[PDB]
Design a protein around this ligand. Sequence first.
Ligand code: MG
Length: 256
Amino acid sequence: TVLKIISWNVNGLRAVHRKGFLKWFMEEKPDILCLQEIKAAPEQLPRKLRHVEGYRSFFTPAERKGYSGVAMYTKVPPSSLREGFGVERFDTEGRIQIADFDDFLLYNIYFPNGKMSEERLKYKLEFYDAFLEDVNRERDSGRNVIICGDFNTAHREIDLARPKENSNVSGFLPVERAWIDKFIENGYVDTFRMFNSDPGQYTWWSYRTRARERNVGWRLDYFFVNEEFKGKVKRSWILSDVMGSDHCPIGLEIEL
Ligand SMILES: [Mg+2]
């Protein structure tokens, strides 16, 4: 039995709905769909918009109105979800949704963008720190873990079109890249690279400067699993032709 999980930074749920979201979701039929950047008060969402037949849904909004926010659709519900690491400043931005399924925890994470300022870059790296602490704690206790979402960093030079010009832009700073190295070193596997070693494989393109048509993109969205669980991973891929956001969806298929 295959379980298909999709992750997508939709850049606003209302926006992606105007651009074919429901038709796409109906045709793709994942078992679990993880979404980032909802940008909406869930309580203000009409049912025609939020509810999708055959799926349970769970929404984790930011304190700040219209900002960030994540959500999860699933055919089979988790036993519960956790919405933070236990650290106030990281738990109030609508960035963390951790669902407990039988066989794994599924981390649906919208990691912070560090471009804004040195303070937001500091926040990003310390968020990374708190995340690693959290997943390590769970992984240490014998849990298998799947982590998906927008990491807001391209790992290696192959993971973006313009590595040299972005050497001092947040998203490709040596400090950020080094954290992904560290995360991997700690026993988590970048599942896409298990199957695809090719260049030009990205998940985000600026809406500006015709980036998507020029494939001037960055691989910012990942599926990671812990080392012990990797044997269950059968596919990890990029749904590059799916429109509606500045990111495209990514997919994981696992056999349990
Ligand atoms: Mg966005």
